[PDB]
C-alpha cells in the first residue's frame, strides 16, 4: 500500500513511506554493525506505529551520534522491528526517529 508492515504479521502497519527521511549522509537506509557483529540495514523514519518499547534509552554503540536507542518490537507478534532513537542534546533535528530493520518489514525492500 502506502505502508510498511511487520513481516511476521504481514499486515500490521508499522510506518508509511512518507515518514522515511535521510538522517545520515548515506541515505534513508544503510547497513550498520552492532557490537556483536550482527548487520542491520536500518531505515530511518520520523514515526512508527504498533511498536512496544523495551527498557530505557541508551547511547552505548549508537549508530547515530547524539541519539540514544530503545528496542522496539511488534505490538502484535513481539517480533523485533528496530529501535526508537531519542535525541540527547536539545539541538538535534529531529528530536526523535525510528530505525526499522529491512529484514523485519514488508514489502521486501
Amino acid at each position: 500500500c502506502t505502508s510498511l508492515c511487520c513481516k511476521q504479521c504481514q499486515e500490521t502497519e508499522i510506518t508509511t513511506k512518507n515518514e522515511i527521511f535521510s538522517l545520515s549522509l548515506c541515505g534513508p537506509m544503510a547497513a550498520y554493525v552492532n557490537p556483536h557483529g550482527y548487520v542491520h540495514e536500518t531505515l530511518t523514519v520520523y514515526k512508527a506505529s504498533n511498536l512496544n518499547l523495551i527498557g530505557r534509552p541508551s547511547t552505548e554503540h549508537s549508530w547515530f551520534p547524539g541519539y540514544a536507542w530503545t528496542v522496539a518490537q511488534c505490538k502484535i507478534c513481539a517480533s523485533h522491528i528496530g529501535w526508537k532513537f531519542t535525541a540527547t542534546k536539545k539541538d538535534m533535528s529531529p528530536q526523535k526517529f525510528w530505525g526499522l530493520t529491512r529484514s523485519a518489514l514488508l514489502p521486501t525492500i
Binding site: 552492532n34 556483536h36 550482527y38 523495551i54 527498557g55 541508551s58 536507542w69 528496542v71 518490537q73 513481539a78 517480533s79 523485533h80 529501535w83
Partner: peptide
C-alpha cells in the same frame, strides 16, 4: 542481566533470553 546479542533487548533470566534469541 542478559542481553540479546542481535537486538540489545535485555532480560532478567537466561531462559527468557534463550527463547527470545531463537526467535531472531
Amino acid at each position: 542481566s542478559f542481553v540479546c546479542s542481535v537486538c540489545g533487548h535485555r532480560f532478567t533470566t537466561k531462559g527468557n533470553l534463550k527463547v527470545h534469541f531463537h526467535r531472531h
